[PDB]
A paper describes a structure:
Bile salt hydrolases (BSHs) comprise a diverse family of microbial enzymes that catalyse critical BA transformation.
To examine the molecular foundations of BSH substrate specificity, we determined the crystal structures of six of the Lactobacillaceae BSHs examined above: four glycine-preferring (LgasBSHb, LaciBSHa, LingBSH, LreuBSH) and two taurine-preferring (LgasBSHa, LjohBSHc) BSHs. To examine the recalcitrance of MCBAs more broadly, we monitored the deconjugation kinetics of 5 BSHs that had previously exhibited assorted substrate preferences (LingBSH, LgasBSHa, LgasBSHb, LjohBSHc and LreuBSH).
Author numbering:
A (entry chain C), C (entry chain B), D (entry chain A): 2 to 322
B (entry chain D): 2 to 318
Write the structure that this text describes.
């Protein structure tokens, strides 16, 4: 997975992710409206206060999101974090206890600013509890963003719960976020500016085409390598103006770091690849997506009809693997 | 630039390119209909016999294509080939003489199969002659493809005119095609299969996520590096079924190797990037494209109306 | 800097380092004998109880070692750890307080086994105090080894004092040791075994020469990259038999990862390069070394004459930069 | 294999190679004296015009060199060139015909300057014939150097006989020399100067250590990769003064690009590695070498006693594999 966020000069947020998986989930766009039942495994049951859009599955009427965004412009994406994610065996008294899947709606229902999320997370404990006994707990970490800032949330055996500022605007997979941030110092030799003709011991040596300054940028799908490239692209991509250009910029970056079908075969023998790329535009309350086998940009919107539905609105399910 | 071609299991061709440039050409989709006037600098002027679609600019009523495709499913893309491309100073008696820009319509107007093109090229001489005094001659090389095979055409000071089979289905920029083919042998260590946990002197070392077998795959935009990655992705992407899935596969590969705005600044100080990605589907006669600043997939079609137009038709972006 | 240790099948230790620097030190081999004055900033002054050999400089009769090894087979090398090393502003009551430079002789004078060092370090505090006001405090971390095991010692603002088992046998420079260990998982695609001929879409693609399995092994001098390469070479270098073959194996690995003069210019404008490579062989009590401008392998030995000297034995000083 | 040549400011040549192989040869230093029998397959037999030193084997009194250097300062090294090298089926009328193994002594016996070698090579034909029927024909290419210049000689099925100027001072293995020269343009992003602290989307990103400018320099043993690295190191290594410093500079570069034992296993299951590194110093008429299992720098010299011997002079044979 790769998560990405950035804004335009007007404070409009473009935020979303590639989902990179090696099996089917039947994922689809879900709109969760206001006043919808919101049970919790450890907290009091309540109802939704905000409409939410994103991609996920529905289990017994509960929308379990891979990534989702509220009508106020605050979103969250859960990305794979294997060999690292570790949640508590049971709830911890005194904490706000959430089964790990519940963080998606807890963040998007209760807050409009990442600043509020950061403060509340100081007393949150994530529990190794699945939606029901027929599912396994997904090893995930999260990127959360509004138009002002983004944070990363990781819970591990090594470090416990950590919350990091994410000025880079990106996230991938394992290992932990500080490891990846530290890794960027090893790529400071990257330069967008092309090299020029040189003399190596008197032998003329000159570029054959543009791009020579980024020698060493990795193009494989190892999470550390996609992190470096996504951070580098986001750091150097100029500001875009308008909805079309910012959505395009977003898909340009995420499609650059997509995991391409056939290029990764896991130890189980299955293809791992980017099954979808999705972008939420806070300015237009529109969720854009395309899929590995259908490149058409589909759009889904939070509006006065969808936000006030009495039922979940579910769209066509995408199948693969 | 990156050119790409592949077919499905039913013989439908998907063929197109990224255009990676550092200036605006004011390009758009041009449909050249049948019976349109077609001048030649060194041949008898004539008219088009086949309709053609693609991306380019119109210069004094001449459609100058970056890449274009005829109604019979034969196409050609011209990609930058600096420090290498060299064409004749003037026409050479006894040869079919073409100004280099004229190869685009010469190929798409006179042939339906690459086999015919390969034979006719044996007596073609490309000439260093611009469309008019107001334009420079573009240093280009070409990929030409139908549903059966693709060829690469390069004319260089170093090697003269060369025509290669292109089983890999890809082309980028300089150096020459044989140089790139030879480079692939240095990347035989790439493997789509993930690595497994290991012991380094007793220290457990294990992957943190998937993708470990492709360690060393380059992700920068140097032409040699886009060539390796595009070739590797095309070699390992399984067959796709149907128009939607094949167009998506095509765009998945080309967007992976796109040159991203802001990540390349040339020595003249300008950003170089993938301004558009375009795919021609021979089976639907449809040219798909999106642009750096508009990701929506746009479609333009050779149909009985557009193919029989009395005008050039252009669609702007 | 790159530190390296390994043993043969008879328990003989080969341990040493490349010193990679950008300024002159006039360094040379120093034998510190038994019964030599040993002052401490925060402990009772004493005398040496064990003879030590290594490379260093002499400051008012105090031998300050870059790396050193005692007559009982226990050694330590201090390697640069910039942007990370952090020692306490002053001594801490109740701790064994050592100015950071004092760890070299504290370790080699008081112990013969790493197991003892590990236990004693539980109550050690390293202080940011130079040998005198005319010297800066070097930001260092250390590898310590006997014939049974090696440890890494790092003290940082990020993590405080950490002591790691170093099964890999290597150490370089920043960042911290756990970061480098974690980085190795990103290089699991490396394989000593050569690739074979392949078909890419029907195009024959075959190796042009041997070595194809290690595609992606980095050859620059960034510390993370030398760590990966040194760890990989040591992991795959077979056992060697006898003194000459083990010393050669050692120099083969370290010279492979040397920082080559002219290839690195630091931001202060100075060339940084491997000024020397050195190996202590515990089995022969011999320190082997060569230098960037003199490749001859020189030997210096702890014996009954040198170990019982009344004076420091200082061999020729090596000037550079 | 990697070949390297450079000079000091006084016109003294340092020229030699790493021998990287996957089988035993029992190689050793051989001095071929003046007036020694010199048979040719396709030319009249003669005697040696001058003394030569280098590394090789002796076959029925014929010294067959991996690399060799005459007393007048001209040398040649034969390096593996598989999948390319192709010599003629039998001699060709009107040419100076040499079995490919005969070029080593043909060049070093008949010439002092590369300019004269190049002119003579215009009528030379290399023949696919072994020293006797018990040996295969080695698929070699050659680097030839004096103090003024170096050339590469390649005879391939792809290109026929080609002679290239070698300002870079290096040679490795396949593919052909022009391919490698062309490859260097793809590495123009390399810069000895370290990067500086940067801001990636407002996130401070700074080097952890020196060497960041050479991001992307490959460290594996694929021939193209050793060629890039060897060329880059030679291009940037400053001038050295005197015999010791220049010999050290030479060994520093070649040991940096050595093929390390255990890190390359060929498809036949055998280790490929640098069995020796050797350097001829024209100014001292001395051949320096060390070996994978004996790092001592040994010296062998062309002098009044060795150049005038009535018999071939051989030194100890080095076995491996």
């Amino acid at each position: 997975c790769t998560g990405l966020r950035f804004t335009d000069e007007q404070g409009n947020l473009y935020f979303g992710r590639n989902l990179d998986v090696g099996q089917d989930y039947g994922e689809g766009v879900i709109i969760t409206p206001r006043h919808y039942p919101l049970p919790y495994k450890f907290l009091d049951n309540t109802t939704t206060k905000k409409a939410v859009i994103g991609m996920g599955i529905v289990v017994d009427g509960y929308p379990s999101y891979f990534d989702c965004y509220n009508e106020d412009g605050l979103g969250i994406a859960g990305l794979n974090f294997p060999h690292f994610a570790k949640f508590s065996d049971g709830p911890i008294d005194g904490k706000i206890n959430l089964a790990s899947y519940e963080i998606m709606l807890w963040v998007t229902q209760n807050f409009t600013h990442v600043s509020e999320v950061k403060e509340a997370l100081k007393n949150v404990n994530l529990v190794n509890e699945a939606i029901n006994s027929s599912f396994a707990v997904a090893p995930l970490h999260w990127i959360i963003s509004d138009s002002d800032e983004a944070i990363i949330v990781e819970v591990s055996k090594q470090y416990g719960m950590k919350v990091f500022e994410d000025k880079l605007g990106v996230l991938t997979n394992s290992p932990d976020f500080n490891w990846h941030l530290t890794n960027l110092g090893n790529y400071t030799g990257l330069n967008p500016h092309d090299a020029t003709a040189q003399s190596w011991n008197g032998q003329k040596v000159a570029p054959w085409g543009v791009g020579t300054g980024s020698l060493g940028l990795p193009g494989d799908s190892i999470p550390a390598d996609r992190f470096v490239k996504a951070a580098y692209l986001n750091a150097n991509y100029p500001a875009a103006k308008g909805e079309k250009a910012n959505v395009a910029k977003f898909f340009n970056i995420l499609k650059s770091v997509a995991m391409i079908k056939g290029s990764v075969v896991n130890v189980q023998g299955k293809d791992e690849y980017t099954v979808y790329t999705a972008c939420y535009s806070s300015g237009s309350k529109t969720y854009y997506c395309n899929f590995e086998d259908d490149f058409e940009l589909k759009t889904y919107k939070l509006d006065d009809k969808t936000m006030n539905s009495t039922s979940l609105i579910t769209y066509h399910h995408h199948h693969h693997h």
